[PDB]
């Protein structure tokens, strides 16, 4: 009998193998501390191996033998550089975005905020400004442009119907979700488990993206889980609560030893709460990509409702050739002077004609 | 004799642990723990009147 | 067997020798209170000497003999003026700046804020204003203009890849860093250790420049570490947290008996937080040099994006001759009335022609 799951090490030195729901489950498989010390396993490690039905007085099946860890043999798990010891650098290898049902949006992203592997990216928008739909487009474009990469879709504190839509529209990539019906604790647990799994995979030189809707809601859960910290930050935030979201987001990085973690998360702003704006500003100093969407641009029903001027990346020279870089510089010079809605409509009109390379020509 | 008492108690714990010990890779620690008899010797040389 | 390190005296009367990482390690060398008293060693004192492998039950190596302290014989440690009693003066020894990859930057710095030995300076900029790049230029310029002076780079709460870039671009000078991935505890510890080392060296008549990126993040770590202090200052600051940053900064000074401690630090402003603005104003009352960077100039891609009018020092006469002083006075009078971006463009065009002294003619 074979079982599979993701390793979750308990305080007692023994661990459990989890299912996709990322929670304690009756079918979780026991893993003794002995096996953990044997295979140098770590939280988030994907473990597959023969297991047996629990003996009398055993409530959970036990892993009889370890066969594969993160889809590979356990040996390499003993001798491998630790994720925290991997060198973090800039994303030096870009990804071109294209999704058939909306190529306008993917091309506009390509021209505004090119994506590389190891990206720490963020999209900032008021409610109802193309955020969730845009993230769907990016997921689809990745699953057409970067099939090799372990694409992970994480949905925190968000809408159940959106979970269903993305589950169905992600064509099989790992969609993990925890709706607003769930308490913050479930959100934090699932998010951290997914995070640890991603870091374990990237440890193996693997390429991962985490598409995190509502990183702000994750920060809210982090705040509410922070038990005192003493003083409260202005706007209702806690001083030490944001350390966990900050580390969470800053884990994404380019590795000079292979593989990387690219996290694209969604930020809410202009919500009338100092809390949201403070979270936005705090994460901006950690991220290498910001893409702004304007509420007014939505209100006119012109899409994708992107705020061109505010959007951009850092170190585009590392993801673009000089021709593309100077093209982008020319375009931004042309667009800097003129209004958001007008700018976006005009750009859509120009880009509707041809694919980006021809609109260049 | 306090030494033997400590060894007997240690035999109890190591006995339970070996059966709990799934694999045979349990001799060093899963079989060995000096807390009981060590504290017993302390008890006899300090807590014995 | 020879060992080396920097002395960290613990609460127990015995100390440890550390490496560049500025924390506890397994390889730190034990130093008995007897040796400390014998050679009057203090925290930050650099100790080199023959050591021995630990005996059984010993966990760290012990310094069998002291050979050199602060690169000199231990006897002088007995008879030397203590750092805190060194008479402070104004910086009476200017440092000319020239860095080939951007001599316009160093030139404008010279024409806006001449640098001396013992300078207590600050560069104030919003996010993404070349603050970090300007600090890099200053470092590179010092590493040819003042190769003699012990150049220490302290990066606190900042981007790991920037740490790598400065490590490689500093050409071997002492780069100490503690990224935002670290808790404030690590930041404070490393900063204090580096500071104590610097004061110990300057006590030896030594010259030190500490280029500290993110002094405001250091203040943030101080605020987070401060256990209560009770009442909250406006902006979320703590009343007594800033005491330690203030002392840290005010330590920089001109010594009338030899050596100097100069600290150039990077400050954040226009961040939307009263906290940063209060920190800036509080430090401005202790420093002698301020160089202001404008976000709008960066948005126009005009570098160095300096706010000339807000830029300046105190007691420039001590760092400039009469001809230079009056030339700078003329230059400010002309540029006093001009708009920031346009004034910078004017100055850059005028300086692009030739070297500064040639620009005078
Ligand atoms: N590119 C688009 N094309 C068509 N409809 C869009 C587009 N972007 C957003 N919308 C509309 O906006 C609504 C909510 O968008 P969503 O992105 O979920 O809001 P938010 O940006 O707050 O997540 C949807 O009902 C959808 O019809
Ligand atoms: N002199 C310059 N030359 C080229 N790029 C610059 C210059 N100054 C700033 N930049 C741009 O600004 C960014 C660095 O921001 P930085 O100055 O480190 O932030 P802060 O000013 O808050 O420390 C880089 O991405 C770079 O493109
Ligand atoms: F309500 Be929206 F999706 F932020
Ligand atoms: F974002 Be900058 F480096 F302060
Ligand atoms: F900083 Be001054 F003394 F007002
Ligand atoms: Mg939405
Ligand atoms: Mg910076």
UniProtKB/TrEMBL annotation, chains A, C:
ADP 2 binds at residues 128, 130-134, 137, 159, 217, 314. Mg(2+) 1 binds at residue 131. The gene is rho. Mg(2+) 3 binds at residues 158, 162. ADP 3 binds at residues 129-133, 303. This is Transcription termination factor Rho. One of its GO terms (biological process) is DNA-templated transcription termination. Keywords: ATP-binding, Helicase, Hydrolase, Metal-binding, Nucleotide-binding, RNA-binding, Transcription, Transcription regulation, Transcription termination. ADP 4 binds at residues 130-133, 159, 162, 214, 217, 266, 314. The chain holds residues 60 to 420 of 426 of the full protein. Its EC number is 3.6.4.-. It comes from Thermus thermophilus (strain ATCC 27634 / DSM 579 / HB8).
């Amino acid at each position: 009998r074979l079982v599979k799951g993701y390793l979750e090490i308990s305080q007692d030195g023994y661990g459990f193998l989890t299912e996709n729901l990322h929670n304690l489950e009756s079918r979780v498989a026991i893993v003794s501390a002995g096996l953990i010390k044997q295979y140098a396993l770590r939280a988030g490690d994907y473990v597959v191996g023969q297991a047996r039905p629990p003996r009398e007085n055993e409530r959970y099946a036990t892993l009889l033998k370890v066969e594969a860890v993160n889809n590979l043999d356990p040996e390499a798990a003993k001798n491998r550089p630790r994720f925290d010891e991997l060198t973090p650098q800039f994303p030096d290898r870009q990804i071109r975005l294209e999704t058939t049902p909306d190529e306008l949006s993917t091309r506009v992203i390509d021209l505004l905020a090119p994506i590389g592997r190891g990206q720490r990216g963020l999209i900032v928008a008021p409610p109802k400004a193309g955020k969730t739909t845009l993230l769907k487009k990016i997921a689809n474009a990745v699953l057409k442009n970067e099939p090799d990469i372990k694409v992970i879709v994480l949905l925190i504190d968000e809408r159940p119907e959106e979970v269903t839509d993305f589950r169905e529209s992600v064509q099989g990539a790992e969609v993990i979700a925890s709706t607003f019906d769930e308490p913050p604790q479930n959100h934090i647990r699932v998010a951290e488990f997914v995070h640890e799994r991603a870091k374990r995979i990237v440890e193996e030189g693997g390429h991962v993206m985490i598409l995190l809707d509502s990183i702000t809601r994750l920060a809210r859960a982090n705040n509410l889980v922070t038990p005192p910290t003493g003083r409260t930050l202005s706007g209702g935030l806690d001083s030490a609560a944001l350390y966990f979201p900050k580390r969470f987001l800053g884990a994404a990085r380019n590795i000079r030893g292979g593989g990387s973690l690219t996290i694209l998360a969604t930020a809410l702003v202009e919500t009338g709460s100092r809390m949201d704006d403070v979270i936005f500003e705090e994460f901006k100093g950690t991220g290498n990509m910001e893409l702004h969407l304007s509420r007014r641009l939505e209100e006119r029903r012109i899409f994708p409702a992107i705020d061109i001027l505010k959007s951009g990346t850092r170190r585009e020279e590392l993801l673009l050739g000089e021709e593309v870089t100077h093209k982008m510089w020319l375009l931004r010079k042309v667009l800097a002077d003129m209004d958001p809605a007008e700018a976006m409509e005009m750009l859509l009109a120009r880009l509707a004609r041809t694919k980006n390379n021809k609109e260049f020509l | 004799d306090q030494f033997r008492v400590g060894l007997a108690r240690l035999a109890r714990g190591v006995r339970e642990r070996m059966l709990m010990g799934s694999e045979d890779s349990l001799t060093p620690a899963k079989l060995v723990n000096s807390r009981p008899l060590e504290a017993a010797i302390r008890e006899f040389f300090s807590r014995s009147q």
